[PDB]
Amino acid sequence: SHMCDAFVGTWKLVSSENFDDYMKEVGVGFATRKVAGMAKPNMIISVNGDVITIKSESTFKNTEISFILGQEFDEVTADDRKVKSTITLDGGVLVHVQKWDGKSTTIKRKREDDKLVVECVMKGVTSTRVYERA
Ligand SMILES: Nc1nc(N)c2ccsc2n1
Numbered sequence: 001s002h003m004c005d006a007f008v009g010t011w012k013l014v015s016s017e018n019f020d021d022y023m024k025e026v027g028v029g030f031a032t033r034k035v036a037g038m039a040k041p042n043m044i045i046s047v048n049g050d051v052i053t054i055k056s057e058s059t060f061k062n063t064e065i066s067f068i069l070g071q072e073f074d075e076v077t078a079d080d081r082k083v084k085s086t087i088t089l090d091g092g093v094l095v096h097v098q099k100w101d102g103k104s105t106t107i108k109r110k111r112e113d114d115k116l117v118v119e120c121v122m123k124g125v126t127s128t129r130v131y132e133r134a
Contacts, residue, residue, distance in 0.1 A: 011043040011131035022127035
């Protein structure tokens with residue numbers, strides 16, 4: 001048993017709050033915000049040794065990241081930003097920081113009851129995205 005066991009699995013988005021405002025704060029344009037805001041992504045998390053893989057699949061885009069905790073990597077986000085990402089574990093919470101164009105956003109993923117709760121923060125704006133097991 002290991003680090004992220006309770007995150008591993010296939011998850012489906014069941015609720016979202018303030019995601020449009022988060023996307024605005026990030027700089028996402030109108031058409032992408034409207035189309036991306038409809039999606040109910042599946043998040044598939046797996047671990048193989050030190051390598052964590054998070055796939056996110058939706059009608060809008062399929063994305064995939066693989067990474068080692070604490071080790072920066074390149075990520076192309078669903079809204080087509082080219083970012084430099086670092087993901088760490090902080091007291092059981094996966095903390096994902098994305099840097100691009102002098103900007104920064106942080107995405108936190110945590111287990112709460114039977115849900116996986118995703119909190120996306122850009123300056124003063126937070127969006128909460130709740131996933132349940134598929
Ligand atoms: N693949 C993918 N991943 C995401 N996080 C989102 C959010 C809206 S659409 C979408 N598609």
